[PDB]
Design a protein around this ligand. Structure first.
Ligand SMILES: [Zn+2]
Ligand SMILES: [Zn+2]
Ligand SMILES: [Zn+2]
Ligand SMILES: [Zn+2]
Lengths: 331, 331
């Protein structure tokens, strides 16, 4: 039983403490190769990511899942470089986020399924590195193309057992329509994580998804512009709900009996060209711990609020292993 | 005095018969590297392009200008491969068309100018291949970002002397606004080709641009769905005006005294992933001559209609050389 990482297959027990929704860089296809000076240089970005992953590993992280797709500018060779230098496993993704180019947008469900299967079963580009998760997105009601993408992701998952993870506009309850589409293709909800679910306080929405068997991605816990209310860019990106408000949704779903369905992350990054210039200065001021925020701050905060150690181990170790290890079911 | 090609600098006299607006592949950034099987394979696409360029060279073509940008999926290494194997010079482009990703759309004029200057002055990616033209686009009224792109293209041209060439929606007279923006940055119109100008019959529009000193790109001469009216995709792409209607605009502008300002091409390609599946089967049925259509069919057609050989030489040889060779003026 094995999970594909950017340095090859690992056994389930090697994943350890896992961050299920992270990025080395949030960019666009071809952008890092065409304009590396945007990031200072490719080597500056790699070095920044290695320092950050090493601090995360010191705090207990063993694996991240980089849910950057083709259209997030995923560079699997960069991921393999930083994975080896930090001694942190990195799982890469296939799928499409919400910035696909025309060459993707004009494709049918069947064509997209071929593409996703290429990246899971054969490899990414000419690297032979295989994805271990499928990432998809909506930002409100699905576009016609996004519906095709979710259907293709379901077909790819149904052939390979690799799971699907999503970007939502949680405030618009996108996970409802996502689930509908996935289920119409026969996908088991145990193979799906409805992500950015901590962006909403709506427990009716969150428990309706969890009750039908979805995994719930509380993956933006450090996202907050509190203290920076006069930076419009920062507020628009991060919102004005506190990291504590977000982290308490982890406790809320535990208290409702869904501990085995929660996945927790930071949705952090080391470079970010798909937003305003100099946004990394803001992010690194907001959350200097970066990807170590979950182990260093959230885990202690939940213990202090009464969540048992055994439960926190289930969430950070066992749930990612069960979710990632390929299957048409995971329970 | 020299023009940058994908195999290095050439002197002005080496360009010869030049097609100013062509593509090896119409795609999207990263797409050919991520999904080469879309095109059958990368080698099938390369071989197709070499066969086509060799037939063009046999018909008299010596140079093409591949006006594929970053967001058209320009692969300069593919261009250099096909250039060497066909013995046809290829000039590459910088700039942005109308499918930029978020990592480009969020950039300022100054940032975009740096990017364009990178590709002209330093090189594309890590290849050391330098662009010899800047490509920009609108599709009707400029978006705010497109206005930034046109301003950056003007700044890049003003530093380097490399010209600018445009995509328009000619039916909406986009060249008027393009010219306005370019002139507000101080760009000389002799450094600008307003392209797809044969997509309209409006001579008031065409002569207003030519009178102010623009070059006029009559670059879609073989584009016609006549004979395929029941193929909605094909009609929408190609229109229902004949190649003869288009070619007669070359004569019209000659007759109005603008021979020195006309640039003629095919806007052909060998692969096309940014439109509907199997569109190349349609294009190769519509125009089996491909890029050789201008020398094989248009040049004889204009001679038959009374255009002097000397004038056709001015248009296919001298105008491209004067336009491409770097300068802040070209007259
Ligand atoms: Zn997201
Ligand atoms: Zn993310
Ligand atoms: Zn065009
Ligand atoms: Zn074109």
């Amino acid at each position: 039983d094995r999970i594909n990482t950017v340095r090859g297959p690992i056994t389930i027990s090697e994943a350890g403490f896992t961050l299920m929704h992270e990025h080395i860089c949030g960019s666009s296809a071809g952008f890092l190769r065409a304009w590396p000076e945007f990031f200072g240089s490719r080597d500056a970005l790699a070095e920044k990511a290695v320092r950050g992953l090493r601090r995360a590993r010191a705090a207990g992280v063993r694996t991240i899942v980089d849910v950057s797709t083709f259209d997030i500018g995923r560079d699997v060779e960069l991921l393999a470089e930083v994975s080896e230098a930090a001694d942190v496993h990195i799982v890469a993704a296939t799928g499409l986020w919400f910035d696909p180019p025309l060459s993707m947008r004009l494709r049918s469900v069947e064509e997209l399924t071929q593409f996703f299967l290429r990246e899971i079963q054969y490899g990414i580009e000419d690297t032979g590195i295989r994805a271990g998760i499928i990432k998809v997105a909506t930002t409100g009601k699905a576009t016609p193309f996004q519906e095709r993408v979710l259907r293709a992701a379901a077909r790819a998952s149904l052939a390979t057992g690799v799971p699907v993870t999503t970007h939502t506009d949680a405030s618009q309850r996108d996970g409802e329509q996502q689930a509908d589409i996935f289920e119409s293709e026969g996908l088991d909800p145990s193979r799906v994580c409805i992500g950015h679910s901590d962006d909403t306080d709506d427990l009716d929405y969150l428990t309706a998804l969890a009750a039908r068997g979805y995994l719930i991605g509380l993956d933006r816990i450090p996202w907050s512009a509190i203290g920076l209310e006069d930076n419009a860019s920062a507020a628009a990106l991060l919102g004005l709900r506190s990291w504590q408000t977000r982290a308490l949704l982890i406790k809320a779903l535990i208290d409702q009996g869904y501990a085995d369905q929660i996945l927790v992350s930071n949705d952090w990054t080391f470079g970010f060209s798909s937003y305003v210039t100099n946004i990394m200065d803001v992010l690194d001021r907001v959350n200097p711990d970066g990807m170590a925020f979950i182990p260093l701050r959230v885990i202690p905060f939940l213990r202090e609020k009464g969540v048992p150690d055994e439960t926190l181990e289930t969430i950070m170790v066992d749930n990612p292993a069960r979710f990632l290890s390929p299957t048409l079911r995971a329970s």
